[PDB]
C-alpha cells in the first residue's frame, strides 16, 4: 500500500507540473494578444483622428 501511495503521489505531482505549464502558456498567449491588439487599436484610432 505504501508503494501505491508513492506511485499516485508522483503521478499527481507531475500532473500539477503539466497543468502549470499549460496555464502559464495561456498567460503568455493572453499577453501577446493584449500587446498586439493594443498596437492595432492605437493605429486605428490615430488614423481616424487624422481623417477627422
Amino acid at each position: 500500500d505504501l508503494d501505491l501511495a508513492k506511485a499516485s503521489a508522483t503521478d499527481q505531482l507531475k500532473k500539477a507540473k503539466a497543468e502549470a505549464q499549460v496555464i502559464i502558456e495561456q498567460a503568455n498567449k493572453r499577453r501577446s494578444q493584449i500587446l498586439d491588439e493594443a498596437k492595432a487599436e492605437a493605429e486605428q484610432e490615430r488614423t481616424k483622428i487624422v481623417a477627422q
Binding site: D1, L2, L4, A5
Partner: protein, 52 residues
C-alpha cells in the same frame, strides 16, 4: 537428618550449572524476539506514512 559433605559438593554443582547457563545457554537468545517485533512495528509505521 543427614547433613552431609554432599551439601557442599552440590553447592559447587549449583554454581557450575549457573555458570554453564550463564556462558553458553542464555547469551545467544535475546536477538530473535527483537527482530520479530521490529518487523511488525515497521508495518504500522508504513501505514501511517501512507496515510500521511
Amino acid at each position: 537428618m543427614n547433613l552431609n559433605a554432599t551439601i557442599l559438593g552440590q553447592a559447587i554443582a549449583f554454581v557450575l550449572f549457573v555458570l554453564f547457563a550463564m556462558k553458553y545457554v542464555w547469551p545467544p537468545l535475546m536477538a530473535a524476539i527483537e527482530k520479530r517485533q521490529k518487523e511488525i512495528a515497521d508495518g504500522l509505521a508504513s501505514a501511517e506514512r501512507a496515510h500521511k
